[PDB]
Design a protein around this nucleic acid. Structure first.
Length: 50
DNA sequence: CCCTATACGCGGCCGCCCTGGAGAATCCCGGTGCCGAGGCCGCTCAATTGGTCGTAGACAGCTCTAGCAACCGCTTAAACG
């Protein structure tokens, strides 16, 4: 609505984080929501691929 | 019937076996001298006693920060089989 489609940061606890992931998958499927966990190589993969 | 050689016992001298009194070596006792140790005395200086005074530290009070017991949760690298 307000065309504020820039980078947004959401910091959540790890235990409730799939309950955020399916909410982003269902209620806002058009958004480019990405998820940030893993070891050094997975975070590097997210960093230089996405 | 008397002399003369002849075999036989043995007085005296020499050598060998058994026992006794005098002297010498040894152990014990008494008197005396020397070394280790204990007691006493003289000097003598440092510990003791008494008093005074300053202050070191105990005590109380207030403020701020580290530690501690017991729990959580995530990561991940180290320990273990």
């Amino acid at each position: 609505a307000r065309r504020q489609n820039g980078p947004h940061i959401i910091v959540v606890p790890l235990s409730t984080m799939p309950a955020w992931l399916d909410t982003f998958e269902k209620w806002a499927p058009d958004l480019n929501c990405i998820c940030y966990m893993g070891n050094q190589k997975s975070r590097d993969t997210i960093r230089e691929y996405e």
